Amino acid sequence: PIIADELEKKHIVLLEMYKQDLKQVQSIFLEGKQFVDSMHENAPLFLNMPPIAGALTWCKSLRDRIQEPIEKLAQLGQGITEREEYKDVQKLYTSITKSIKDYEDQKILSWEKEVEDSSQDKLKQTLLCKDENDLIKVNFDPSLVRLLKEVKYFLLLRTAKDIYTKAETYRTQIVALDMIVDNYNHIK
């Protein structure tokens, strides 16, 4: 009881601190969310990563920071859950999580449609020579690079096989095709 009385006063102060972190994350999230959607410079996503893939990874980092305290909070005894102030903070946390998922769902949802469009680009890009001079260059859509790099990030954050299987074959053929094209243009 001696130390226990002091602990109750400490618990309300700790709950108040989590309120500031939740509000700070939310306020940061709203400013950050607008930049990510428009793919503006100095965006929240760290360094260089696929923009659609990066938004999901960025959402996860914000989500991880918000939920680290909740596991620790559930640890506290003496029915700190009953406290109305503790309940109010939990409601704020649930609202923030729901908004992040919807944004993630739009990105993944919109990305899903983009992936179907991207599949066609790999199928019908080929290698195109441009200008009067026959300077053959790989015409592999730059989008393909983002889609392939995009998939690897998704694995990190937790009938198309045959096409992906001849992904290895396509790379070998393009390198072989590129060498003859350079040789065939020099003579020309």
Add this chain to the structure above:
Amino acid sequence: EKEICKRSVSEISWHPEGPTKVAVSYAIMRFQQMPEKMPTQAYVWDLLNPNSPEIKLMSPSAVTNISYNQKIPDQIGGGCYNGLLAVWDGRKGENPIMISPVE
């Protein structure tokens, strides 16, 4: 000055002998936000004259990180955006003497 779009200073390094020269490498970490055929050069500044870089380092691709080497004076080694590794000499600058195989 007058670079196409803007180039972020991804990495900054200090001269090993003393703080008189700083080597800064410019590249865009944003994925696909870099303009096609954007300038990809590294400039080493001099504390005495900050109006323009004392020497210019030219690389095949933008160098994400460049750092000085204490063992050999005025030798700079950097990593390109493509993954190519290049080495430049601070005294002569210009093109990179050592370049790693791409594949």
Add this chain to the structure above:
Amino acid sequence: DGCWSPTRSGAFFLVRRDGWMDVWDYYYRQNEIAFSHKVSDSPLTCIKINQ
């Protein structure tokens, strides 16, 4: 980017992506930043300290 001061072990400098650089000194107060300075409006990509 955050780098330790070569001259003094106690203080280390961290540069935020908000364009603000804050110096953390553990010699005097562990709890708060020694001082905060805004280098520029643009985000600070990296910080290097001379040796």
Add this chain to the structure above:
Amino acid sequence: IYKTSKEIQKSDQRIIQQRVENSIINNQIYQKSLKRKTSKRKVRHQANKKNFQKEMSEVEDTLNRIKTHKTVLGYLIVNSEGGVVRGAFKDEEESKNIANSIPLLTKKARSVVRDLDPTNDLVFLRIQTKLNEIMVAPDDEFSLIVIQTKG
């Protein structure tokens, strides 16, 4: 524009003079002196300027206070080279005689103290006459002499 240019120049001059002063309060005697020496391009105005010809109250203020103090005839500062830096006496003849005669006695008196111990140097000397008391404080840069009638 010529007038404008002139104004600009003046402003520039003012800035240079300040620097250490940093505007704000009129402040400091030392600062003013330095400005006058180094750059004489601009002078006066700038701010309130406090009291004219009063760079520091404390040495000047203390001397004024001792002179104001009751039973003190006056305090005359003697220059290291037999000169009157400042004279505050009712009659010029007494001040003129005090200005030349008193320093010679102190120099002779300093040697008397000096002969007994070379390291020891005169710090303060006080001569008490039948009707008056004479106090002389000696320093290499300046000498302070005060005559106070005995109570």
Add this chain to the structure above:
Amino acid sequence: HLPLDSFVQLQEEYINSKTDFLTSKNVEVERAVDDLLQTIMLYPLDPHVDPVLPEETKRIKRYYFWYFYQALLNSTQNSLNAMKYRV
């Protein structure tokens, strides 16, 4: 170099080295002035407020340029004192 044809040629080489050095500093001073202007321009401030004043920018450069003139003449005057000492 305070401390005939040979002295003049040697002095000219010494003067040339100083001139080469001084030029490097001018580029650095201009960049520093531009950086200060860029940081003020970079400031987000308030949307319903004037971002910056064009006159204000000119005064910062002009006054700094004027300040440089005070320093540049100051240096030339020091050489004259050395010449008087040499005499």
